[PDB]
Design a protein around this ligand. Sequence first.
Ligand SMILES: C[C@@H]1O[C@@H](O)[C@H](O)[C@H](OS(=O)(=O)O)[C@H]1O[C@@H]1O[C@H](C(=O)O)[C@@H](O[C@@H]2O[C@@H](C)[C@H](O[C@@H]3OC(C(=O)O)=C[C@H](O)[C@H]3O)[C@@H](OS(=O)(=O)O)[C@H]2O)[C@H](O)[C@H]1O
Ligand SMILES: [Ca+2]
Ligand SMILES: [Ca+2]
Length: 480
Amino acid sequence: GVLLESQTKITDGALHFDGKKLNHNTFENPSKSQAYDYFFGRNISAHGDAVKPYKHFVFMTWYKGGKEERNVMLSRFNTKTGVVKTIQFPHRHTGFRGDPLVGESHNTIGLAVSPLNGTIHMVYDMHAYVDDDETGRFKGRFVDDFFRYSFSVAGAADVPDDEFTLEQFVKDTSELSQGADDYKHLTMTGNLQDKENFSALTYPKFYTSDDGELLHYMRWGGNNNGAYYFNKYDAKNQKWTRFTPFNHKDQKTHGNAYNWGLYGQMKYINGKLRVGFQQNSANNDDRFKYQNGVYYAYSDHPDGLGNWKNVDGEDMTWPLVNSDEIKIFEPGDYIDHTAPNSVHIVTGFDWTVTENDDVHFITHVRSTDTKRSDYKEVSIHAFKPANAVDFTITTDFTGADSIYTSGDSIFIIGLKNGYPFVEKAKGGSNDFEVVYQQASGVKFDHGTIHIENGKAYYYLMEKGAGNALPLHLQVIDLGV
Ligand SMILES: C[C@@H]1O[C@@H](O)[C@H](O)[C@H](OS(=O)(=O)O)[C@H]1O[C@@H]1O[C@H](C(=O)O)[C@@H](O[C@@H]2O[C@@H](C)[C@H](O[C@@H]3OC(C(=O)O)=C[C@H](O)[C@H]3O)[C@@H](OS(=O)(=O)O)[C@H]2O)[C@H](O)[C@H]1O
Ligand SMILES: [Ca+2]
Ligand SMILES: [Ca+2]
């Protein structure tokens, strides 16, 4: 029953890093040519939490194309009329550590629209930025601008197409305003005293609760010392709460044997705030070069403020200090190496929970040393049916980067030879089948997905040369 219901071009020129990959030794001599060099990956548009359906619209964010442009953009697509109206913001992608010549793929444009009062929310262009000066890592380039929040008056999301302009959005008019085209707010609470609470964050991601409340979470910190922080939109007062931690930072000072970072996602699923991740311990003497384990917890509090529990319903220390409390299993156990740093876990992790409360995790493990003779590589699917005691754990699985769910089913959705495909399985099972594979039309380089209404919103960038490429929105019915 899977089928493409619409494909809609949004622009001919969104930003893309088409230049050379830089590193620690080279990033300070980026090309001044027409090619746009980058430091991590090439993707920045149609990337991250950049697509949201709201009533009969779909809102999308992107970076204006052209190495020399880079403006934050917001588009609203009218599903009934076919009209795509775009707003161009003044802020331009500031690049790796604030140098626009080096593309920075972390700095996505997160987006949300409040069902309660029709305000629009955007957090963007952020990668652990703090206040510092000429001698710091960031050379003073983010002072009074390390958290970048833009948002509209009430009702902006429903205004006629002629009124959907930058005039719908609220200026920074505080003591720290950088001027007349300052649309970036340093906090979401409206109180600059809260500013340290918004420092050093990455990865803006929004959810809507079952009662229409906007939730938001970001990641503080780095590789082996990080935390998830989450907050809530007060639509009545048109402001957000301060950020609250899922786990403590600097766990080793809060009672843990080691500091650890997190690689995973918080998600609002089945009407609860939940988290699934692999940890990255600061210990460099054990067998895991980077990540290890699979962890999961959920909150019985509507806003996540306490009452956390692990998969077995046991109370979790909160904010969490010791990840052991919520560990499900060790992907490391599926490879035989035990020597220090011999086990490599980074890509291929995600998780989901079905409407029937089937819990699913996917992961990937390989030998650190790819040249060894007994090299090993497995993909893992760990899943527990609703009415099951234990998890079923299998390496009879091809691997994936994401897992999705809708209704009774789980899905794997991505690109194969430039075209979207969908694989589907019953919730609580490992029985995946390809049920959809686009086979004609322009091909795509990358994209990002949002599931809702039994549909996948696949926000995509078309393949091509240069650093200004077209964007298309595909709406795919999953047919559940
Ligand atoms: C957290 C670190 O803290 C300090 O070291 C410092 O602030 C540093 O950032 S820095 O100032 O720029 O150097 C931070 O180090 C990077 O942090 C990233 C993070 O988790 O925030 C890490 O990026 C994640 O993992 C990357 C591997 C991923 O990159 C994609 O995947 C791969 C690959 O698998 O080989 C290659 C490409 O880099 C890219 O396509 C990141 O993706 S993202 O799209 O850029 O967001 C991200 O998931 C990063 O590895 C740290 O070194
Ligand atoms: Ca500002
Ligand atoms: Ca380690």
